[PDB]
Write a protein that binds this ligand. Sequence first.
Ligand code: SF4
Ligand code: SF4
Lengths: 150, 71
Amino acid sequence: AKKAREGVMEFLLMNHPLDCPICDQGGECDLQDQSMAFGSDRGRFTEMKRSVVDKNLGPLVKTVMTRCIQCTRCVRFASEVAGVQDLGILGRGSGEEIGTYVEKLMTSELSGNVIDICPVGALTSKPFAFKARNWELKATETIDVSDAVG
Amino acid sequence: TEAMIRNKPGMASVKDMPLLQDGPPPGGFAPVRYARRISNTGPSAMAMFLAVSGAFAWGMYQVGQGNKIRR
Ligand code: SF4
Ligand code: SF4
């Protein structure tokens, strides 16, 4: 089991760009916290990682699909929970790219939660562009008052 | 990585990596002294008393002769 986990966390960090310093979700990252806990301490891949252009997904979700690991979590969230069906896993192989095939802002509300859904920095809040870090933020378990769902 | 940081053109293998870091030269350094080499080659117990006593024996005679000249 541990060798299988290390194997996979090497593949994920293989074509993944070294964007952790410039990644908005640098501290709060499943990939960083699984590599620093279950993945191997070193990487043997020394070649040309694949890179992906940044899709325009609107004024909410800043997208850096190079970081994205193509786990498909968001393309499932938009199809099922958000129910708008705009995101897609275009292409096959390493060339897999997540996002709308035509430039299409995620017109759906409830589609800003894809950032919390995303286990990787790729999909991040564009309003919270880089303004802070996962460790600076003091958290209060407040409620919301915008809409009456509370 | 670690085979793209320490290149050494060729080398056919992950071993034989350059590995040039600081250390003693081949054959170590010189034998360094650590003991207390305090040389006691000074005037002995005598030769210091006999220089002082000799100075007293002759120099006080000279004080006497100078007192005779002054008188
Ligand atoms: S998601 Fe961002 S912070 Fe996490 S490993 Fe990838 S580049 Fe680094
Ligand atoms: S949730 Fe994030 S990491 Fe997963 S496929 Fe979508 S963009 Fe890529």
